[PDB]
């Protein structure tokens, strides 16, 4: 075989082997038989026999038994800045935001209403349909690399599902929230106490702590969930509206909430706020408000963002008990 083909074959076989090492050792959830894996590793070691320049301390052949999977939280840039949200706590504040929106873009704006989860923000990047990076918010330009931890989350697919309706983008940065269900928060605290560790005081702290683990195998043992609620940088995907982008996220296998609705104007927004004020306790994870977003992407650009926040979105937060 020629040297280009040698380097091609090595990279592909090293990556396939490393992925199964991760799934077996960190996730404890292999997806091929031990017999299959053993053939893979033999072929890889054979190929490194011929070409010993390919054998590095970094090779999966040198990182056997689960070695070499540690998270170090190194800073990593978001592709597009990941801002926080301005908040509204009163009917008046929300109407004021609604008025400013109308005065700038008129009735052409409609309002996506989503449930606000009290969890830990996570930004995922997929390149050519494969997960390459996951990071915390950090300061909005730069977050901490927790890629390996996120790869253990059951709701986070490693690969996006192709479909002719919605082609897999070349690059997709998708934002979302990690959290625990209430029943799993309690069960994890019981487990922790049984081992002599302190329980967590709330499910948010518990999710953050469970995600931010130097050894991702700890994260893999915990029932972290995720729900996508936003788009950063995308290439090869130009959705006209946020609600239509959720259709593509679903088609690709990414988790989305079933409690999002599309409203026409402020009266429709107020009804969803009133409704979830009465029923949010029925959701099996923590909801602390309702995020109202202008749905039309073109109008999102026109209205822009400030240094710290989008002008086309507001979080209505409920008063704490
Ligand atoms: N459904 C959602 N849509 C957008 N952002 C959300 C959502 N849920 C949580 N967040 C993030 O949660 C933060 C809201 O701040 P907080 O008042 O502390 O709830 C925002 O900065 C968001 O980026
Ligand atoms: N099924 C898999 O994906 C997978 C991956 C990595 C290691 N393994 C198994 O782990 C073990 C390697 O450890 P020993 O070869 O030291 O037993 C073998 O059983 C190997 O097959 C399995």
Domain boundary residue among 70, 101, 118? 70
- Rounded to whole angstroms, what are the CA distances from 6 to 20, 41, 54, 177, 302? 21, 16, 9, 41, 50
Question: Is 85 annotated to bind ligand?
Answer: yes
Give 289's DSSP letter: E
By the 8 A CB rule, do 143 and 137 touch? yes
Residues 307, 236: one domain? yes
Q: What is the resolution of the experimental data for this entry, in Å?
A: 2.2
Distance 117 CA to ligand 1 centre (A): 7
- Rounded to whole angstroms, what are the CA distances from 32 to 28, 46, 129, 242, 274? 12, 20, 21, 37, 50
Q: What's the number of domains the chain is made of?
A: 2
Q: Which of 112, 249, 227 is nearest to 177 (CA)?
A: 227
First-residue to last-residue Cα distance in the chain? 69
CATH of the domain at 307: 3.30.470.30
Six-digit token string for 29: 């959830």
Residues 183, 234: one domain? yes
Q: DSSP alpha helices (H): ranges in 199-265?
A: 203-211, 216-220, 242-252
Domain boundary residue among 53, 70, 87? 70
Determine if ligand 1 sits within 6 Å of the CB of residue 121. Answer: yes
Give 189-205 as a DSSP string: HHHHHHTT-PPPSSHHH
CA 218 to chain centre: 18
Q: Which of 146, 143, 10 is nearest to 79 (CA)?
A: 143
By the 8 A CB rule, do 208 and 120 touch? yes
- Which of 241-245's residues contact partners 24+ apart within 8 Å by CB, and which partners? 241/112, 241/295, 241/296, 241/297, 242/112, 242/293, 242/295, 242/297, 243/112, 243/295
Six-digit token string for 147: 């890629």
Residues 91, 104: one domain? yes
Q: Which of 212, 124, 242, 235 is nearest to 175 (CA)?
A: 124
Task: Provide the b/e sequence for 209-223 (b: ≥16 CB within 10 Å).
Answer: bbbbbeebbbbbbbe
Residues 162, 64: one domain? no
Contacts of 278 (CB under 8 A, 6+ apart): none
Give 28-97 as a DSSP string: S--SS-HHHHHHHHHHHHHHHHH-GGG--TTSGGGS-TTTT------EEE-SS------EE-SHHHHHHH
Residues 131, 158: one domain? yes
By the 8 A CB rule, do 150 and 224 touch? no
Residues 86, 33: one domain? no
CA 207 to chain centre: 13
Residue with tokens 């039309």: 296
Residue with tokens 């995922």: 124
Residues 42, 125: one domain? no
By the 8 A CB rule, do 225 and 152 touch? no
Residues 40, 84: one domain? no
The whole domain housing 286 covers 71-321
Residues 9, 137: one domain? no
By the 8 A CB rule, do 156 and 223 touch? no
- CB count, 10 Å around CB of 256? 16
Residues 310, 186: one domain? yes
Determine if ligand 1 sits within 6 Å of the CB of residue 87. Answer: yes
Residues 12, 31: one domain? yes
- E-strand ranges in 96-236 read 111-117, 120-127, 130-135, 142-144, 171-179, 225-235
Task: Provide the b/e sequence for 83-108 (b: ≥16 CB within 10 Å).
Answer: eebebbeeeeebeebbeebeeebeee
Per the entry, the structure determination technique was: X-ray
- Rounded to whole angstroms, what are the CA distances from 109 to 216, 294, 296? 43, 6, 7
Q: Round to whole Å and give the CA distance between 211 and 51.
A: 39
Residues 156, 22: one domain? no
**Which residue has the CA at smallest separation from atom 3 of ligand 1?**
229
Check the CA dihedral 227-233-237-239 and report its sign: positive
Q: Round to whole Å and give the CA distance between 246 and 255.
A: 9
Question: Is 36 annotated to bind ligand?
Answer: yes
CATH of the domain at 50: 1.10.287.610
Q: For ligand 1, what atom is nearest to the CA of residue 82?
A: 23
Q: Round to whole Å and give the CA distance between 8 and 188.
A: 44
Q: Which of 40, 37, 181 is nearest to 119 (CA)?
A: 181
Say whether 197 is catalytic: no
Q: What pairs with residue 88 in β-bridges? A: 316
CA 216 to chain centre: 16
Q: Round to whole Å and give the CA distance between 33 and 38.
A: 9
Determine if ligand 2 sits within 6 Å of the CB of residue 79. Answer: no
Domain boundary residue among 44, 70, 96? 70
């Amino acid at each position: 075989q020629t040297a280009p083909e040698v380097l091609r074959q090595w990279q592909a076989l090293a990556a396939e082997v490393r992925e199964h090492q991760f799934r077996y050792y960190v996730r404890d959830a292999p997806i091929i038989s031990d017999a299959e894996f053993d053939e893979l590793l033999r072929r890889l070691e054979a190929l490194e026999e011929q070409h010993p320049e390919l054998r590095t301390p970094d090779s999966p052949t040198q990182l056997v038994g689960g070695a070499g999977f540690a998270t170090d939280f190194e800073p990593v840039d978001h592709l597009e800045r990941m801002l926080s949200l301005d908040n509204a706590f009163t009917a008046d504040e929300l109407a004021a935001w609604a008025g400013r929106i109308h005065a700038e873009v008129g009735d052409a704006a409609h309002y996506l209403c989503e449930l606000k989860i009290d969890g830990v923000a996570l930004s995922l990047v997929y390149r050519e349909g494969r997960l390459t990076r996951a990071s915390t918010r950090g300061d909005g330009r730069t977050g901490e690399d927790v890629t390996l931890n996120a790869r253990t989350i059951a709701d986070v697919p490693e690969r996006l599902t192709p479909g002719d309706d919605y082609p897999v983008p070349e690059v997709l940065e998708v934002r979302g929230e990690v959290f625990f269900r209430l029943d799993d928060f309690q069960a994890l605290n019981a487990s922790l106490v049984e081992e002599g560790k302190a329980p967590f005081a709330n499910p948010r702290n518990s999710a953050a702590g469970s995600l931010r683990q130097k050894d991702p195998a700890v994260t893999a043992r915990r029932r972290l969930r995720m729900i996508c609620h936003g788009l950063g940088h995308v290439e090869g995907f130009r959705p006209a509206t946020l609600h239509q982008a959720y259709l593509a996220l679903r088609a690709w296998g990414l988790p989305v909430s079933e409690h999002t609705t599309l409203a026409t104007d402020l009266a429709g927004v107020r009804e969803r706020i009133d409704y979830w004020g009465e029923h949010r306790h029925e959701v099996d994870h923590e909801i602390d408000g309702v995020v109202v977003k202008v749905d039309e992407v073109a109008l999102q650009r026109r209205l822009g963002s400030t240094s710290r926040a989008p002008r086309w979105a507001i979080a209505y937060k409920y008063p704490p008990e």
